[PDB]
Design a binder for this molecule. Structure first.
Ligand SMILES: Nc1nnc2ccccn12
Length: 165
């Protein structure tokens, strides 16, 4: 199971870990991808998870987009987890750098409530441009299911735990 996570709340746990290595170690039921509406896994968590699947996640995502069209910002889709998880929940958080609306972050976290336990990154953090402390606050106030957050950056992980209200 998940090991070395610090408990933040009744259901939110956090660890300084690379979500790719965490997924390969644990092989959880659900790994969350920090997706964009086109499921174009270029950089950040998405590029990293996709590279770990040897691009199989992108091939599957392009077929999903050809059939269904793009996701909504705040939306999600369940696809295969490939070598990382049983499933991958592709969640679209608002990308502040691309000028998207930060109010959609709560809607993005609501997708986690459809899964009992998830391995996930902080939505809209990293290359998505939002304040990670705000993302963790929205996470703990929105997600009711068991969420194991993997924070790649050590200094950010320290800042998050030490500043947690
Ligand atoms: N393995 C890896 N490479 N880049 C990133 C970014 C976020 C989380 C994991 N990452």
């Amino acid at each position: 199971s998940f090991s070395g996570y610090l408990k933040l709340t009744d259901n939110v746990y956090i660890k300084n870990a690379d979500i790719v290595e965490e997924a390969k170690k644990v092989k959880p039921t659900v790994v969350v991808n920090a997706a964009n509406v086109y499921l174009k896994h270029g950089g950040g968590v998405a590029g990293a998870l996709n590279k770990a699947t040897n691009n199989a996640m992108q091939v599957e995502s392009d077929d999903y987009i050809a059939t269904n069209g793009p996701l909504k910002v705040g939306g999600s889709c369940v696809l295969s987890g490939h070598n990382l998880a049983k499933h991958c929940l592709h969640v679209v958080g608002p990308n502040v750098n691309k000028g998207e609306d930060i109010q959609l972050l709560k809607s993005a976290y609501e997708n986690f409530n459809q899964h009992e336990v998830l391995l996930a990154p902080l939505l809209s953090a990293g290359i998505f441009g939002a304040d990670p402390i705000h993302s963790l606050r929205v996470c703990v106030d929105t997600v009711r299911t068991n969420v194991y957050l993997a924070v790649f950056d050590k200094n950010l992980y320290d800042k998050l735990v030490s500043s947690f209200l």
